[PDB]
Design a protein around this ligand. Structure first.
Ligand SMILES: Nc1ncnc2c1ncn2[C@@H]1O[C@H](COP(=O)(O)OP(=O)(O)CP(=O)(O)O)[C@@H](O)[C@H]1O
Ligand SMILES: Nc1ncnc2c1[C@@H](I)NN2[C@@H]1O[C@H](CO)[C@@H](O)[C@H]1O
Ligand SMILES: [Cl-]
Ligand SMILES: [Mg+2]
Length: 330
């Protein structure tokens, strides 16, 4: 069907720059973290100019869906909804999406600025600090189901819970009433797991595929009960005549772990190796996870197997990490 994947997310503009450790220190940032800017960090945005940054579209789910659209090629292969400000920045993101053939319906938040994220690279690690702006006012239009008519794969990032959990909840609920439809969710970041516990709980029950990195599940284990393999098998309970129930945990260069609960109750686990990539060849890890999910969703949509999906995800992520910031090559 026309649209294969539909997602909701926070459309944001990324400002990427390589900075010294001292910068991270002055802005109270922890290397490798992902957070929402505090008032004392708002100054990061203007101060980056001295580092000759580069700017490009960002937004986790948006990066993911762009990979899918890039791979499926046909216009409207992937659809996305989110909110942008009524500023020039928002227009730029929109035009870029249109040029890619992505199907979109952006809600404009009057008088608000489009979200921006500072992608700071130090060593070879990335730290993300975002100012959501307009993204926080996103409200799914009631006719979204029509716009996404035909998609069987629905995706949302936990990052979207900040605007309101209602958005992801409506997407999940709708996918649930559709046969052969699956709802997929990304834990997105530690802060998401920690702050949106109750909402996550209701969402997980309706989630078919849960994605996340080792760091994200650890917090999920703590926040919940259960407290690699065990954490992964643990999480499967939270989600738990066979509707897809799978958990996919990424772990940098370590093997990818995917646990699935089949129709009969049998739990099947897969530990898939990740091809070695020379450290000197690694540029930056910004967007590795997003590309992984994009490759994974693209493959899933092609009916490939769980192992094959992971392989496709690994391939996309490897390419992207050998480039500055995100990259749509392949
Ligand atoms: N050192 C490494 N060598 C090879 N692949 C790596 C890698 N680090 C990450 N990856 C690839 O990227 C996938 C996801 O990595 P990971 O989830 O740890 O990225 P990340 O969370 O930094 C991304 P983001 O910046 O988008 O939040 C891995 O499964 C693997 O395929
Ligand atoms: N809160 C939030 N919401 C959506 N996307 C986000 C963020 C944050 I902290 N970081 N990012 C995006 O994650 C990508 C890296 O995985 C970057 O492109 C960046 O825009
Ligand atoms: Cl997002
Ligand atoms: Mg990483």
């Amino acid at each position: 069907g026309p649209m294969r994947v539909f997602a909701i997310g926070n459309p944001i503009l990324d400002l990427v720059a390589e900075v010294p450790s001292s910068f991270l220190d002055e802005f109270f940032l922890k290397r490798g973290d992902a957070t929402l800017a505090t008032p004392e960090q708002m100054r990061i945005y203007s101060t980056l100019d001295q580092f000759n940054p580069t700017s490009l579209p960002g937004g986790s789910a948006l990066n993911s869906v762009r990979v899918v659209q890039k791979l499926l090629r046909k216009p409207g292969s992937a659809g996305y909804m989110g909110a942008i400000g009524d500023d020039p920045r928002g227009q730029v993101l929109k035009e870029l999406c249109d040029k890619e053939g992505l199907a979109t319906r952006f809600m404009v938040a009057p008088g608000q600025s489009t979200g921006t994220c500072a992608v700071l690279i130090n060593e070879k690690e990335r730290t993300l600090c975002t100012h959501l702006g307009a993204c926080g006012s996103f409200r799914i239009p009631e006719n979204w189901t029509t716009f996404a008519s035909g998609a069987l794969i629905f995706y949302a990032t936990a990052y979207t819970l900040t605007a309101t959990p209602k958005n992801a909840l409506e997407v999940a609920g709708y996918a649930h009433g559709i046969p052969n439809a699956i709802f997929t969710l990304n834990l997105s970041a530690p802060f998401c797991v920690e702050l949106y516990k109750d909402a996550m709980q209701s969402l997980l029950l309706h989630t078919n595929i849960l994605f996340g990195n080792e760091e994200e599940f650890a917090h999920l284990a703590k926040v919940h009960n259960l407290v690699k393999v065990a954490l992964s098998v643990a999480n499967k309970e939270h989600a738990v005549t066979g509707a897809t129930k799978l958990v996919v945990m990424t772990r940098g260069h370590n093997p990818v772990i995917a646990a699935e609960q089949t129709a009969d109750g049998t739990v099947v686990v897969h530990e898939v190796g990740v091809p070695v990539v020379a450290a000197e060849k690694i540029v930056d890890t910004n967007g590795a996870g997003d590309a992984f999910v994009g490759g994974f969703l693209y493959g899933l949509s092609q009916g490939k197997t769980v192992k094959q999906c992971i392989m496709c995800g690994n391939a996309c992520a490897q390419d992207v990490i050998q480039h500055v910031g995100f990259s749509l090559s392949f």
